[PDB]
Structure formats: structure tokens, C-alpha cells
Amino acid sequence: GAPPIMGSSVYITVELAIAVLAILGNVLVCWAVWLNSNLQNVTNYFVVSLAAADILVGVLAIPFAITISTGFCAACHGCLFIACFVLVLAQSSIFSLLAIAIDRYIAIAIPLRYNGLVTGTRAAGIIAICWVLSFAIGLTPMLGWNNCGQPKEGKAHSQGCGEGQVACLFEDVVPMNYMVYFNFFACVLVPLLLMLGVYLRIFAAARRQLADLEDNWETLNDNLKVIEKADNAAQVKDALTKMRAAALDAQKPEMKDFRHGFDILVGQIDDALKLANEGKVKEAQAAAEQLKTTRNAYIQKYLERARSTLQKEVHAAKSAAIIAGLFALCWLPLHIINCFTFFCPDCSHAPLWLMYLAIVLAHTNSVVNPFIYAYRIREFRQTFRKIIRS
Ligand SMILES: CC(C)CCC[C@@H](C)[C@H]1CC[C@H]2[C@@H]3CC=C4C[C@@H](O)CC[C@]4(C)[C@H]3CC[C@]12C
Ligand SMILES: CC(C)CCC[C@@H](C)[C@H]1CC[C@H]2[C@@H]3CC=C4C[C@@H](O)CC[C@]4(C)[C@H]3CC[C@]12C
Ligand SMILES: CC(C)CCC[C@@H](C)[C@H]1CC[C@H]2[C@@H]3CC=C4C[C@@H](O)CC[C@]4(C)[C@H]3CC[C@]12C
Ligand SMILES: CC(C)CCC[C@@H](C)[C@H]1CC[C@H]2[C@@H]3CC=C4C[C@@H](O)CC[C@]4(C)[C@H]3CC[C@]12C
Ligand SMILES: CCCCCCCC/C=C/CCCCCCCC(=O)OC[C@H](O)CO
Ligand SMILES: CCCCCCCC/C=C\CCCCCCCC(=O)OC[C@H](O)CO
Ligand SMILES: Nc1nc(NCCc2ccc(O)cc2)nc2nc(-c3ccco3)nn12
Ligand SMILES: CCCCCCCC/C=C/CCCCCCCC(=O)O
Ligand SMILES: CCCCCCCC/C=C/CCCCCCCC(=O)O
Ligand SMILES: CCCCCCCC/C=C/CCCCCCCC(=O)O
Ligand SMILES: CCCCCCCC/C=C/CCCCCCCC(=O)O
Ligand SMILES: CCCCCCCC/C=C\CCCCCCCC(=O)O
Ligand SMILES: CCCCCCCC/C=C\CCCCCCCC(=O)O
Ligand SMILES: CCCCCCCC/C=C\CCCCCCCC(=O)O
Ligand SMILES: CCCCCCCC/C=C\CCCCCCCC(=O)O
Ligand SMILES: CCCCCCCC/C=C\CCCCCCCC(=O)O
Ligand SMILES: CCCCCCCC/C=C\CCCCCCCC(=O)O
Ligand SMILES: CCCCCCCC/C=C\CCCCCCCC(=O)O
Ligand SMILES: CCCCCCCC/C=C\CCCCCCCC(=O)O
Ligand SMILES: CCCCCCCC/C=C\CCCCCCCC(=O)O
Ligand code: NA
């Protein structure tokens, strides 16, 4: 039995290293949003709430985790607070991650009502509400779902604890049925699966909208060819009728030129339709050839801009999804071990070294988001560079 202070020293040193890095990187995130107005939008207010949770992992939850690893004598309800506060921060992170996903879904599904629906003022009230809910969920053991009524009195006496005190150890005070059914299944797993469903909807909506843009374009170019090889006024008329509906369909500084572009296009379709309906096939076909000028000078530019805007939303949603996936990857090992402890009382408990490895992996999640923003989001990377240089 090696002196406990040796493995303790390794664990604590690693925790302190993670705390340092979590504070530094997430303070940098908050400083970038505060300073750069191109980063001040509703999405990034949830990003800052998430960075605040991660700063508090470094400032409070890691010092608390170091403390509870010692099994020090404590009043049981004080022990519960330092065991459960990290659950508040994890719960807050979950709400922020779900909000980021929903925000991006609203942006890609209804971009015309996004700015009217999702405002800074409503985001700050959602954030406040979510922090209150996170305290209620993470500190639910303090409302009475705890093991303080059944203290491990032999362990308390062996350590010389005083009356009313327990050896402060996570699995002695926090019930495992709370950890598995309430904290993990209800409060973590279900929101993460909801997030997964929202991201699937985002990527499907993007794929569908890019397919629609390409379809409208091909319909435009195919019907031009229909008109070119029609042999009567009625065929020209039918192809132009369709083109007119599609152009109006697609019509739903750069905005002035693209509105001007579609105005010309509808006007030119209308000129060609009138000629067709007068039975003037050749005149109608020549009028339709003028549509190629508008297609080259305006419609193609609209198509390329619309595509590039959707491709940026896909890239941005992938970045946010990577962050949600990394939260799941860093926290799942600990939840899964708790499931074994709880559901398999005939299995030997996960060994101590694995418990602490899973705890430090969960804490490491508070380090990683600044790196994802730096690597995947030019505007953050550039603001980070400017802050670090100045
Ligand atoms: C806003 C921030 C800076 C304040 C942080 C206050 C923290 C450190 C305080 C608030 C409540 C305190 C706990 C309340 C009661 C107990 C039980 C006692 O037997 C041992 C200490 C212990 C477990 C305290 C540890 C320190 C503690 C967690
Ligand atoms: C989220 C991804 C990375 C999956 C991680 C899976 C990890 C957490 C799984 C894979 C194999 C698992 C171990 C398999 C066997 C045992 C022996 C049993 O007596 C205690 C639980 C314990 C020690 C399990 C702990 C959880 C475990 C380590
Ligand atoms: C989408 C995925 C990641 C959801 C997470 C799946 C979790 C809930 C699954 C993955 C592996 C599962 C464990 C695999 C094996 C055992 C040992 C058995 O004696 C009791 C149940 C128990 C302990 C399972 C509990 C639930 C479990 C931890
Ligand atoms: C990508 C890198 C950082 C992952 C690091 C994984 C390391 C830290 C993990 C993987 C295997 C683990 C070891 C596996 C077995 C034991 C034996 C045990 O009696 C003491 C702890 C010890 C020695 C573990 C310490 C932590 C450990 C070394
Ligand atoms: C964003 C990237 C992730 C951030 C990562 C933050 C820091 C984590 C590194 C820790 C290694 C520290 C050295 C650990 C060496 C210990 C080896 C050892 O001897 O283990 C003893 C054993 O555990 C006794 O039981
Ligand atoms: C023995 C003790 C039992 C205790 C059981 C506790 C139940 C938790 C309930 C409320 C905590 C509220 C905490 C305050 C949350 C602050 C929210 C906030 O500051 O949000 C900022 C906002 O973003 C600005 O725009
Ligand atoms: N099971 C558990 N244990 C601990 N710490 C104690 C590790 C341990 C477990 C058993 C033992 O005999 C001695 C120590 N922290 C823990 N944190 C969590 C957690 C937080 C969020 C999800 O799970 N679970 N968890
Ligand atoms: C896509 C779905 C993702 C996962 C959702 C469902 C998770 C359900 C997990 C259930 C594990 C229940 C384990 C019960 C073990 C009983 C042990 C015993 O009876 O001795
Ligand atoms: C993503 C899901 C992956 C699932 C992996 C396979 C899980 C099925 C394994 C069940 C293992 C059951 C082992 C229980 C052993 C102890 C039984 C006992 O003595 O009570
Ligand atoms: C996706 C992960 C898949 C990993 C491999 C899955 C295989 C898991 C196998 C579990 C076998 C458990 C055997 C337990 C024997 C116990 C003896 C007994 O209880 O009588
Ligand atoms: C992503 C899901 C991965 C979850 C882990 C999958 C591996 C599941 C294997 C479990 C094996 C449990 C072995 C039982 C050990 C004790 C046997 C006994 O005492 O009866
Ligand atoms: C994944 C991030 C890097 C992880 C490196 C892991 C090394 C440190 C973590 C665990 C080592 C095990 C030491 C635990 C000793 C028991 C703790 C205690 O009882 O005080
Ligand atoms: C860029 C570097 C910034 C500062 C990095 C600091 C990294 C080291 C952090 C913590 C190490 C503390 C070591 C204390 C050992 C105590 C173990 C014990 O008390 O038993
Ligand atoms: C000094 C005592 C108070 C400590 C409270 C710490 C809470 C977490 C720290 C910072 C989170 C709030 C930072 C928000 C600043 C940026 C806001 C914005 O980007 O518009
Ligand atoms: C335990 C003592 C400290 C506990 C602090 C917990 C409360 C955290 C409160 C605020 C951090 C959230 C900051 C969110 C800023 C986003 C709002 C916005 O940008 O408009
Ligand atoms: C806060 C996020 C939203 C919460 C939604 C919760 C919906 C409920 C989902 C999962 C709860 C899991 C219930 C498992 C019950 C088994 C209990 C038992 O048999 O002892
Ligand atoms: C959707 C995420 C998880 C699904 C929500 C519901 C939770 C999983 C479904 C059933 C789990 C029930 C586990 C309890 C079985 C008996 C427990 C026991 O005997 O100890
Ligand atoms: C499109 C590639 C351009 C390369 C530079 C990147 C510019 C910005 C790109 C995407 C913005 C990503 C926004 C994702 C929201 C993150 C929210 C979160 O999950 O925390
Ligand atoms: C419990 C685990 C759930 C974790 C949720 C993590 C967030 C989901 C992340 C990615 C899912 C989306 C995968 C589909 C990719 C399509 C991309 C594309 O069309 O270009
Ligand atoms: C990112 C990597 C994801 C990998 C998920 C799966 C990891 C677990 C895989 C194998 C572990 C299986 C251990 C089975 C132990 C059986 C012990 C026994 O029989 O008692
Ligand atoms: Na977090």
C-alpha cells in the first residue's frame, strides 16, 4: 500500500494544471467577445455562458474536487455542496450547448424571422433562467436526496471525525440512483440526444436548401433549351410559365443588385410570354435569349452567394457540434462508470486510478473549447491573435 500522498500529489498537480489552462483559455474567449463587435451576437452569448461555466470549473470545481479527494471530516451538508457544485456547472454547460444548437437551427430554418425572434435581450433571460435551473438540478441532493441520513459511522470514527461529521467522499454522500437516473439519464443523456436530433435537422435543412438552389438553377437552364428548340408558340409559353413561377419562387447594396436582377428576369420572362401569347414564336425565342444576359450578370451571383452562405452555416454548425460531441466524450466515461457501480453490485468497483482518470478527463473538457474556436472560427482566431499581441 503506497503512501496515499504520492498518488494524491500526481492527481492534484494534474488538476491544478487543468485549472490554470481552463481559466486562461476561457478568459480569452470572454475577452474576445467583449472586445470585438463582430463576435457580439446571440450565439456567442451562449458561448460566453459556456466559457463562464468552464472558468468556474477552474476556480471552484477543481479546488472542490481536490478537497473531496482527501476524505476530510466535514458536516455532511457542507460536503454535499462541494461534491455537487460541479454538477451545477455541467448542467449549465448542457443548457448552453442545447441553446447553441437551437439557435443555429432557427438561423438555417427561418433566416427571415431569425433576427426578430432571437434577440440579445431574450438570450440573456434564457441564460439567467438556465443558470437558476442548473443550480436546482445540480444541488437537488441538498434538498434531501442524499446519504446524510445514513452516515458511514465506522469510517467517520476511524478518521477521528467529530459528531455530526462524515468523511467527505463523493460516493458516500451523493446517492448513485440520483447520479444515474436523475443526473445522467434525465439531465445529461436526454439533452445530448436532443442536441443530436437538432444537429441532424440542421444538416438535413442545409442539404435540402442547397439541393433546391441547384434545382431552380437547372430548371432555369433546361427551360431555356426547351424554348430554343420549341417549334410553336404554345411550347415556348409553357416553358416560360414555369420559369416565371420558379423565378418568383427564388425571389423569396448586394440586396439592391439582386432585387434588380430578379426584377429584370421576371420582366424579361413577361416580355417573352406576351410575344408567345401573340403567336410570335421567333420573337418570343429571341426575347427569351435575353434572359441569358440577366442569368450571367445577376442570377449566377445570387446562386453563388446563397450557396456560400449555406456552406458557412454548415461549417459553423459542425464547429458547434464538435464542441457538443467533445463534452459528451469527456463526461461519458465517468457517467458510464457510475452506471457499472450502480447496476452491477456484483462487479468489483472501478479501481481508484480509473476513477481519478475519468474525473480529470471530465475536467479537461473545460480546456478544449477555446482551441476549437481558435482552429475553426477565423473571427475568434484573429481576435485571439490581436489580444495576445497587444
Ligand atoms: C463566491 C466564492 C468565492 C465563495 C466560495 C465559498 C466556498 C469555498 C464555501 C461556501 C460553503 C463552504 C462550505 C460550508 C460548510 C462546510 C462544512 C465544514 O464542516 C467543512 C467546510 C465546508 C465544506 C465549507 C467549505 C467552503 C465552502 C464551500
Ligand atoms: C465514452 C467512450 C470513450 C467509452 C468509454 C468506456 C469506458 C468508460 C468503459 C469501457 C470498459 C469499461 C470497464 C469494463 C469492466 C469493468 C470492470 C467492473 O468490475 C467495473 C467497471 C469496469 C472497470 C468498466 C468501467 C467503464 C469502462 C472503462
Ligand atoms: C448513446 C450511448 C452513449 C448512451 C450511453 C449508454 C450507457 C447507458 C450504457 C453503455 C454500456 C452500458 C453498460 C454495459 C454493461 C453493464 C453491466 C450490467 O451488469 C449492468 C448494466 C451495465 C452497467 C450497462 C449500463 C448502461 C450502459 C453504461
Ligand atoms: C493521451 C494521454 C494523456 C492519456 C493518458 C492515459 C494515462 C494517463 C493512463 C492510461 C493507463 C493508466 C494507468 C493504468 C494502470 C495503472 C496501475 C495503477 O495501479 C496505478 C495507475 C496506473 C499507472 C494508470 C495511471 C493512468 C494511466 C497511465
Ligand atoms: C487540451 C489538452 C488537454 C489538457 C491536458 C492538461 C494536463 C494533463 C496532463 C497531465 C500529465 C501530468 C503528468 C502525469 C504523470 C503521471 C504518471 C504516473 O506515474 O502515475 C502514477 C500513478 O497514477 C500513481 O497511482
Ligand atoms: C442548503 C442550501 C440549499 C440550496 C439549494 C439551492 C437551489 C438553487 C436555486 C437557486 C440558486 C440561484 C443562483 C443564482 C444564478 C445566477 C444567474 C446569473 O447570474 O446569470 C447571469 C445572466 O446571464 C446575466 O445576463
Ligand atoms: N463516482 C464519482 N466519484 C467521485 N469521487 C470519488 C471517487 C471514488 C470512488 C470510490 C471510492 O471508494 C473512493 C473514491 N467523483 C465523481 N464525480 C462524478 C460525476 C460528476 C458528474 C458525473 O459523475 N461521479 N463521481
Ligand atoms: C439511442 C439511445 C441511447 C441510449 C438511451 C437508452 C439508455 C438505456 C440504458 C439502460 C441501462 C439499464 C441497465 C439495467 C441493468 C439492470 C441490472 C440488474 O438488473 O441487475
Ligand atoms: C454502446 C453499447 C455497447 C454494449 C456493449 C456490450 C454490453 C453488453 C454486456 C453486458 C455485460 C453483462 C456482464 C454482467 C456480468 C456480471 C453478471 C452478474 O454476475 O450479475
Ligand atoms: C462496443 C464495445 C464492445 C466491447 C466488447 C463487448 C463484449 C463484452 C463482454 C462481456 C462479457 C462479460 C463476462 C462476465 C462473466 C462473469 C461470470 C459469471 O457471472 O458467472
Ligand atoms: C460506449 C459503451 C461502452 C461501455 C462498456 C462496454 C463494455 C461492457 C463490458 C462489461 C463487462 C463487465 C464485466 C463484469 C465483471 C465482473 C464479473 C462478475 O463478477 O460477475
Ligand atoms: C487526460 C488528461 C491527462 C490525464 C493524466 C492522468 C494522470 C493523473 C490522473 C490520475 C492518476 C491516478 C492517481 C490517483 C491517486 C488517487 C487519488 C487520491 O486518492 O488522492
Ligand atoms: C505557462 C505556465 C503557467 C503555470 C503552470 C503551472 C503548472 C503546475 C501547476 C500546479 C503544480 C502544483 C504542485 C503542488 C504539489 C502538491 C501535491 C501535494 O500537496 O501533495
Ligand atoms: C470577482 C467576483 C465575481 C466572480 C464571478 C465569476 C463568474 C465567471 C466569470 C466570468 C463570466 C462573465 C464574463 C462575461 C464577460 C463577457 C460578456 C460579453 O462577452 O458580452
Ligand atoms: C459559487 C459562486 C459563484 C457562482 C457563479 C454562478 C453564476 C454564473 C453567473 C453568470 C455567468 C454567466 C455569464 C453569461 C454572460 C452571457 C450574457 C450576455 O452575454 O448577454
Ligand atoms: C432537464 C432535461 C429534460 C429532462 C427530461 C426527462 C425525461 C425522463 C427521461 C429519462 C429518465 C430515466 C428514467 C429511468 C427510470 C428507472 C427508475 C427505476 O426503475 O428505479
Ligand atoms: C433517452 C435517454 C435514456 C432513455 C430514458 C429512459 C431511461 C432508460 C430506459 C430504461 C432504464 C430503466 C432502468 C431500470 C431497469 C431496472 C433497474 C434495476 O433493476 O436496478
Ligand atoms: C467557413 C470557413 C471559414 C474559415 C474561418 C471560420 C469563420 C467562422 C466559421 C464558422 C463560425 C462557427 C460558429 C460556431 C458556433 C460555436 C458555438 C459553440 O458551439 O460554442
Ligand atoms: C449521447 C451522444 C450524443 C452527442 C451529441 C453530439 C452532437 C451531434 C454531432 C454530430 C451529428 C451530426 C452528424 C451528421 C453529419 C452531416 C454533415 C453534412 O451534411 O455535411
Ligand atoms: C473513442 C473510443 C471508444 C471505444 C468504446 C469502447 C471501449 C471499451 C472496449 C473494450 C473494453 C472491454 C472490456 C471487457 C472487460 C471484461 C472483463 C471481464 O470479463 O470480467
Ligand atoms: Na463545460
Residue numbers in the entry: -1 to 208, 1001 to 1042, 1056 to 1106, 219 to 305
Paper quotes:
Hydrogen bonds are shown as dotted lines and the 1.0 σ contoured 2mFo-dFc and 3.5 σ contoured mFo-dFc ligand omit electron density maps corresponding to ZM241385 from the soaking experiment are represented as blue and green meshes respectively, carved around the ligand.
Here, we report an in meso crystal soaking method developed to improve the crystallographic throughput for our work with the adenosine A2A receptor (A2AR), including drug discovery activities. Previously, each ligand complex structure required a separate, bespoke A2AR-ligand protein preparation. We have demonstrated that an in meso ligand soaking methology can rapidly and efficiently yield multiple high-resolution co-crystal structures from a diverse set of ligands in complex with a given GPCR.
